[PDB]
Ligand SMILES: CCCCCCCCO[C@@H]1O[C@H](CO)[C@@H](O)[C@H](O)[C@H]1O
């Protein structure tokens with residue numbers, strides 16, 4: 033079954049994405065004496081990891097690897113409700129297993145937050161929600177624009193375009209909100225670490241941003 | 256109307272570009288004790304943000320997202336005067352709103368200059384003008400060369416080519432002039448912060464550079 | 479003979495890849511007073527070096543430049559056993575000569591480990607094996623997905639896709655295992671320096687990961 | 702005349718490349734108290750600047766922007782001797798003017814070496830020559846492989862492939878030799894600063910590497 037391949041692809045893509053990218057956040061200075069945070073390192077790993085997973089799985093599942101993307105696809109009727117529930121389940125499960133593998137292989141002294149996304153202390157949850165909405169909006173707009181079959185003018189790698197959209201979300205928002213853009217990516221390490229601080233914003237922010245982008249693309253700009 | 260979609264696209268593209276990219280300049284060490292400035296972080300965010308916005312909006316508006324680009328297009332008769340005034344208005348308005356959103360979500364202690372472009376103290380305004388002229392020249396030349404329909408040899412992503420031209424402008428000029436290349440990008444945070452220091456060079460420099468590049472491309476090299 | 483060209487290409491590609499990339503690991507602070515380790519610098523050099531060598535030699539040899547890739551190709555019957563033995567020999571020999579050239583041109587005071595891949599002291603060899611398995615899995619999956627002739631949807635540079643897969647392996651795993659993904663790349667400097675610590679994991683980990691990826695791609699996802 | 706356009710393009714491409722890229726080397730800490738050297742910043746600026754100039758001028762002049770490339774093209778009979786002398790003149794002149802402009806706009810306190818390429822004190826000139834030979838070899842091989850009309854399999858941006866080859870040359874060799882790969886790029890700031898230390902290696906090394914690569918590509922691998 034093509035469908036079960038696709039669901040398995042979403043699970044595996046998420047597992048790999050989350051393991052590698054959360055892995056890039058590990059501060060090898062430790063919790064007691066943290067080394068400087070390399071924002072470029074993290075932003076590139078998240079962006080290039082998404083580019084790589086879209087390259088690997090785009091033709092098998094569509095390479096959503098993100099519940100907010102899947103929800104935008106449901107709301108624009110590009111995927112069935114039935115398919116969307118299995119994708120979102122696979123994405124959340126994949127994120128849990130990827131984060132769990134990271135936990136198992138990472139020395140306890142440097143695990144730290146295991147890459148959980150958190151709102152800066154000097155931000156409100158409302159401002160964090162807005163940041164996540166906007167960064168996810170631009171990501172989902174990039175996905176819809178890049179994959180639009182009506183276009184004759186798309187050039188170069190679609191996967192890389194999407195990955196660089198992820199990268200810019202991070203280069204801006206890592207210190208504001210952790211730059212989630214992706215409810216499953218936040219969910220995975222939240223489950224492993226039992227850290228649920230403002231967790232709802234990482235569902236509501238990205239999902240609203242994604243649906244707005246998909247809606248604006250499909251029904252306002254390029255119907 | 257296709258035209259109103261295009262104007263709205265220029266506004267939205269600028270808003271997102273400016274929010275994310277100015278956001279990358281925020282020094283989370285604060286004004287009292289600034290951490291080292293990561294020039295790669297800023298250069299990549301500006302370059303990849305332009306690449307992403309061109310990917311998203313190139314087919315809707317042409318993805319100028321820059322009054323100097325729009326002026327070069329007017330002077331080479333690629334866009335009408337009428338259209339250019341609405342584009343430039345949308346670009347300036349979008350930059351103001353993007354910078355304003357950044358101001359609202361950024362803790363006051365780290366707002367700093369809000370990414371306003373300023374001439375180094377040990378540079379003259381004249382040398383700043385020249386720097387901005389040259390970096391904008393190469394950017395606009397890249398745009399005209401990449402989009403030239405006569406060419407059969409353009410390979411890979413046009414958006415990424417343009418974004419990397421933005422990136423190199425920054426990797427050179429951030430410490431000289433702030434590497435504007437873009438009058439609206441300078442205008443937005445200037446309005447929010449009331450900081451107008453040498454502001455005219457960020458209009459005159461890029462506009463002259465852009466018109467020279469467009470003119471040289473269209474009428475000297477590739478007529 | 480096309481075959482001897484291909485074998486010579488694998489040797490030369492490996493030599494250049496290893497010289498440049500191990501060269502990027504040299505800590506010019508010295509063994510006594512090491513400067514901060516730039517993980518981005520190393521990750522980009524390894525990834526972009528593979529992208530460059532695939533660009534240069536992909537059409538001559540297939541651009542494996544990696545015994546684990548070659549083994550995956552043997553197990554999926556994409557290359558003959560006979561050809562695979564000469565490729566693996568050329569790859570190991572090329573890595574030795576590249577690492578040897580690096581040793582000759584590098585001041586003894588900064589040679590350090592000559593970029594040998596080692597397991598972190600706070601990791602077990604088993605966890606190192608798992609890390610190497612997973613990072614090599616995603617790399618080999620990227621190679622099979624990117625080169626799949628059945629696909630009509632691959633966009634942009636195949637070489638760059640593969641290089642960025644290498645880059646993410648590093649951005650995650652440099653501090654865990656040295657991010658080998660490549661038995662020959664580990665073998666070369668091991669020979670020059672006589673450093674064989676946990677060396678077997680850099681054969682077994684990548685080879686298992688590669689065969690699993692090739693097998694899953696060819697027989698489960700995209701038969 | 703197409704020929705005079707091409708010569709002017711080589712001059713202008715070199716001017717811009719050298720200004721921006723040497724500009725990226727300026728240490729704003731000063732000669733008295735230098736800040737850490739960002740190798741990624743410099744490597745990306747040189748690589749992306751070449752990618753950008755090849756994008757801008759490849760169809761006008763061939764985008765050599767490098768006397769060693771031009772010599773390799775002469776030796777493989779891809780360009781006439783007559784044309785090669787004007788290209789090399791334009792390249793050297795462009796490099797002088799670009800470096801001179803940089804000197805004029807850069808505060809005297811941070812000019813430093815103006816990005817002159819020098820051999821590390823703990824390297825011999827012979828080892829510097831070898832480093833320059835190898836890094837230029839891989840660059841020129843990338844150019845010949847990327848531009849080979851017999852190939853049906855080249856994917857993505859040729860300009861970016863070449864630029865990333867430049868980038869890896871730097872990520873390896875900046876601290877060894879300054880990673881010239883380009884006699885004109887070394888010549889320009891040497892003229893402005895009157896700094897000729899080991900200057901001959903930056904002609905002989907790259908030229909030998911370039912001719913070997915061109916020769917091997919055209920006559921051994923892909924005749
Ligand atoms: C827009 C709807 C808002 C309803 C609140 C969601 C449920 C509350 O959930 C709580 O929210 C707090 C504030 O963010 C957080 O500090 C807690 O970690 C979280 O558990």
Ligand SMILES: CCCCCCCCO[C@@H]1O[C@H](CO)[C@@H](O)[C@H](O)[C@H]1O
Nearest residue numbers: 379380381451452453454455456459
């Ligand atoms: C080439 C035309 C130059 C005319 C000067 C423009 C108007 C002056 O404007 C002023 O210029 C000063 C010098 O740059 C700046 O310091 C001030 O911030 C700016 O308000």
Ligand SMILES: CCCCCCCCO[C@@H]1O[C@H](CO)[C@@H](O)[C@H](O)[C@H]1O
Nearest residue numbers: 602603604674675676677678679682
């Ligand atoms: C799965 C098969 C495991 C068999 C062990 C391989 C041969 C042992 O080899 C040794 O292994 C040690 C533990 O990694 C290392 O510390 C030594 O450096 C290595 O020589």
Ligand SMILES: CCCCCCCCO[C@@H]1O[C@H](CO)[C@@H](O)[C@H](O)[C@H]1O
Nearest residue numbers: 825826827897898899900901902905
């Ligand atoms: C292979 C041919 C070598 C001949 C030497 C070239 C001319 C000498 O030139 C000198 O070489 C010295 C050693 O590199 C440098 O220290 C000097 O800066 C340079 O002027």
